[PDB]
Amino acid sequence: ASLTEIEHLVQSVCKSYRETCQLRLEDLLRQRSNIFSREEVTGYQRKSMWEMWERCAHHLTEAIQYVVEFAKRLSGFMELCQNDQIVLLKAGAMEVVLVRMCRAYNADNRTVFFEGKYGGMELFRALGCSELISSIFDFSHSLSALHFSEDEIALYTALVLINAHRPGLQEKRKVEQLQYNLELAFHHHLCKTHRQSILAKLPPKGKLRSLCSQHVERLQIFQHLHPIVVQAAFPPLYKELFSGGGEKHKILHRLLQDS
C-alpha cells in the first residue's frame, strides 16, 4: 500500500495485541518474586500424568481463546474466507501462544509463570515430556535475549499468524499481500525504533513448527495411554487443533461467526 497506510498497520496491530492480552505484562514482572516452593513443586510433581495434562491443555485452550480474538481483530484477517481464517489459526495459534510465553518467562531464574506463581521446568515433570518442556524454556529463553517490546511482540505474532505459505490456503495471494503489508509494518517500526538489527536474531522459521510438532507428537503418545481422558476431560478446541480425530466438533468457526 502506502507509507501512511503502513503507519497505522503498526497502530492497528499494536492496539489489537494490547487489547487481546490475557497476560498483562506489568502483572507478570510484579510476580517473579512469588516463586513456587519445593513443597508446592513436589505437589505438582506427584500429580497423576493425565491430571497435569488435563490442567495444561485447559490452560493452553484459555491462551488460544485470546489468540483467536487477536486474529479476529487483525485488520485484513476477517476479510478472508472461513477456510483460510481457520487454517491460519489451526497452524499458527499455538505458535503465537509460544511466542507470547516469552513474557511469562523470567530468564534470570529460568522460571515461567504458572497458576499464579513462578516455577521452573521441573514443575512439569509429571507430564512425561521433559524433552519438549525443556525446548519451550530454551525457546522463551532465546526470545528473552531479544528483549522484545510489546509493540515488537505485536507485529511479530501477527506475522507468525499471517503466513502465506501455510498448506491448505484456498486463496494464497490474499494472504501474501496481507503478509507483505504486515511485513513492512514490522520492518518500518524496527527501522523507526532503531532495531533493524534484531531481524537476524529472530528464531529460524522452522523452530516454531518443530515445537508445535513435538506437542502433537507428545499428545499422540498420551492419547494412547489415556484415550478416554482426552474424549472426556480435554477441551474441544484443544482436540480440534491438535488431536486426531478431534475436529469432529468445530469450535473454531463458532468464534469466527459471532461478533
Contact call for residue 44 and ligand L7J (CB under 6 A): no
Note whether 99 and 160 are within 8 A (CB).
yes
- Closest contact distance (angstroms) between CB of 214 and ligand L7J is 8
Distance CA 198, CA 249 (A): 41
Instruction: Choose, by CB under 6 A, the member of 132, 146, 184, 202 that binds ligand L7J.
Output: 132
- Contact region for ligand L7J (CB under 6 A) — 29-37, 121-129, 173-181, 249-257? 121-129
Instruction: Choose, by CB under 6 A, the member of 71, 96, 102, 112 that binds ligand L7J.
Output: 112
Contact call for residue 101 and ligand L7J (CB under 6 A): yes
Q: Which residues, other chains included, contact 121 with Cβ-Cβ below 8 Å and sequence gap of 6+?
A: 110, 112, 130, 133, 134, 137
Contact call for residue 96 and ligand L7J (CB under 6 A): no
- Residues 50-69 touching ligand L7J, rule: CB under 6 A, are 53, 56-57, 59-60, 63
Contact call for residue 97 and ligand L7J (CB under 6 A): yes
From the list 16, 206, 74, 214, the residue with the least C-alpha distance to 133 is 214
Distance CA 106, CA 111 (A): 5
Binding site residues, ligand L7J, CB under 6 A: 53, 56-57, 59-60, 63, 97, 101, 112, 114, 124, 127, 129, 132-133, 136, 215, 218
